[PDB]
């Protein structure tokens, strides 16, 4: 869960091994300064079945989408960090993990959507279409 919180609160993995259920394909040498695949939302940040612990399978889509949103704000120059972090543990048929995953999810989407709707304005891009 510390490796998880590293992937969650900032888009960079601060673990210098890859054990985690998310892996990053290296498609950085195909699409750079242009998108012709939409690699972020297809399979660059993908999940792997045999690293799912089978109690995070209910949260799996959420866990993936969280840090996938963080990368495209942490890359361009916006300072983002954790708003708060708290310990989560596998407990028997009870969850510390769900409450942090949901708050993490809303923080992910809120910082991406707020940063985009002000700098690199989507509003004018849709209006000029």
């Amino acid at each position: 869960f510390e490796v998880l919180e590293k992937w969650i609160y900032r888009g960079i993995i601060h673990d210098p091994y890859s054990e985690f259920m998310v892996e990053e394909h290296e498609l950085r040498k195909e699409r750079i300064q242009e998108d012709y695949n939409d690699k972020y939302w297809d399979q660059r940040y993908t999940i792997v079945q045999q690293q799912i612990p089978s109690f995070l399978q209910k949260m799996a889509d959420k866990i993936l989408s969280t840090g996938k949103y963080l990368n495209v704000v942490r890359e361009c120059g916006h300072d983002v960090t954790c708003p708060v972090a708290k310990e989560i543990i596998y407990t028997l048929k009870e969850r510390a993990y769900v409450e942090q995953i949901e708050k993490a999810f809303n923080y992910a989407s809120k910082v991406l959507l707020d940063f985009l709707m002000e700098e690199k304005e989507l509003v004018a891009h849709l209006r000029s279409i």
Binding site: V3, D15, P16, Y17, E19
Partner: protein, 61 residues
């Protein structure tokens, strides 16, 4: 203590790992040695990673 198992458990790994690291880092100095000790923190491996990471912090100072 079961013929000295539980005495031996804490220095056992620390003897194998350091005896490995002294002959793996011979011919290597500076940043190349600092990478050769950060070479061991790579399958995650919490039992070995807890052991190496304090030594590496002084080594790469």
């Amino acid at each position: 203590l079961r013929r000295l198992l539980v005495w031996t458990y804490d220095p056992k790994i620390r003897l194998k790992t350091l005896a490995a690291l002294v002959d793996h880092c011979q011919g290597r100095k500076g940043g190349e040695l600092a990478s050769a000790v950060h070479a061991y923190t790579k399958t995650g491996d919490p039992y070995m990673r807890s052991l190496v990471q304090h030594i590496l912090s002084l080594v790469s100072h």
